[PDB]
């Protein structure tokens, strides 16, 4: 009797699982919202620098009319290489934020020390991918890596059709601080990661005025075999592809149809992505250099580390945000904890979602979210950045692990606006001029120099309908 090789495993549930980390795929959590889980782990924050200047130059006559196709192609060529490293070293890719990426090695606290060594070896192989090459003749893109280790909380929130997850706490806060301390080609360890790490293994140099450290080299001791050490660590790696599946990057590639799991997994993914997954739309439809309006909402709390206090507030804000956006086909692209505060990256005019008077609605929507979230229990400050223009929209990452992302100077601009002008709604010149709303709805703001943005142009507070 023949035993033919089981065919390519390409079910909708497998395609859905590409968009989600193992934290969610194999999560099986309560029905309730908010949901909170606590554990420990080791985080990697990989930032790519250069790619919004790339988005600008790919949004030029140069690339004829294939700017976004050429852009996602070269972006995914480098990002698939990093995703491969992280996966092969046992990491779970939690989230893509443009050309930036957060990874988790979730592990029992006694294994944190050993797992930090694994995550360092990984960090240095990632850097070593970008020691060689370059694009636009010479060099423009390298990576900065921040590492943290300790307590981690996960928050799951949403309603009957949508779900979003966040990771929270001091190791989350630390991994961001560690990353923006780094220069190109650096691996920065958070203080508690350096405190929990195997110091016989790792040569470091001190960071000026910062308690964090900078990794120089792995100097393993004489009886060290990394492959044997790695194998030892895999005992602690729940979902690490092994046995008949050692040839796979993700155990999630072996997921079988399960209606109840698929039902819960699809709530994390946009309906335009599911449409593609269902072969009801062309696979290239979703890669676009497209005019959009970014609404970046940031919520500050007295204590951004306590999921128990803040999770209800995030849930309540989500419930209001989701109903304000629905009206105008606005989307919550991502939610994430960003150097203080819970941030909602909201997008007006995604593919097939282009409402008329996008700018007036983006502004009215912002004020609405501003006023609601200001009266929610335990939200200290609400800040909203509004920016409009040509951004790259597309599926970013690896075949086995990818998400829909927005990339561009306008995304950086909205994000930086909500931080340099806290407690207000702000907008750029494109939104202000374009809305054509009367000039007294706006207040022109002082000029601030802002990180990761060259000329913002004139900026405005959206004051709203009344003088109040
Ligand atoms: N898709 C996205 N999701 C979440 N945050 C985003 C984002 N795109 C941009 N941002 C935010 O916007 C800011 C971008 O500024 P920086 O981090 O200074 C840019 P960079 O890493 O030097 O280079 P880049 O502009 O080439 O990406 C960050 O604070 C980041 O959180
Ligand atoms: Ca980045
Ligand atoms: Cl997150």
UniProtKB/Swiss-Prot annotation:
Guanylate cyclase domain mapped to chain residues: 42-179, 293-418
Protein name: Adenylate cyclase type 10
Annotated effect of mutating residue 95 to A: Nearly abolishes bicarbonate-mediated increase of enzyme activity. Abolishes bicarbonate-mediated increase of enzyme activity
Medical condition linked: Hypercalciuria absorptive 2: A common type of hypercalciuria, a condition characterized by excessive urinary calcium excretion. Absorptive hypercalciuria is due to gastrointestinal hyperabsorption of calcium and is a frequent cause of calcium oxalate nephrolithiasis.
Transmembrane stretches, start-end: none
Notes concerning its domains: The N-terminal guanylate cyclase domains are required for enzyme activity. Fragments or isoforms containing the first 470 amino acid residues are fully active.
Family the UniProt entry places it in: Belongs to the adenylyl cyclase class-4/guanylyl cyclase family.
Compartment(s): Cell membrane; Cytoplasm, Cytoskeleton; Cytoplasm, Perinuclear region; Nucleus
The organism of origin for this protein: Homo sapiens (Human)
Recorded consequence of changing residue 176 to A: Reduces bicarbonate-mediated increase of enzyme activity. Abolishes bicarbonate-mediated increase of enzyme activity
Residues bound to hydrogencarbonate: 95, 167, 176, 337
Tissue distribution of the protein: Detected in airway epithelial cells and testis (at protein level). Weakly expressed in multiple tissues. Expressed in brain, heart, kidney, liver, lung, pancreas, peripheral blood leukocytes, placenta, skeletal muscle, stomach, thymus, airway epithelial cells, duodenum, jejunum and ileum. Very low level of expression in bone.
Residues at which ATP binds: 47-52, 99, 144, 406, 412-416
Modification note: Cleavage may occur to generate the active 48 kDa form.
Residues binding Mg(2+) 1: 47, 99
Function: Catalyzes the formation of the signaling molecule cAMP. May function as sensor that mediates responses to changes in cellular bicarbonate and CO(2) levels. Has a critical role in mammalian spermatogenesis by producing the cAMP which regulates cAMP-responsive nuclear factors indispensable for sperm maturation in the epididymis. Induces capacitation, the maturational process that sperm undergo prior to fertilization. Involved in ciliary beat regulation.
Residues annotated as binding Mg(2+) 2: 47-48, 99
Part of the full-length chain shown: 1 to 468 of 1610
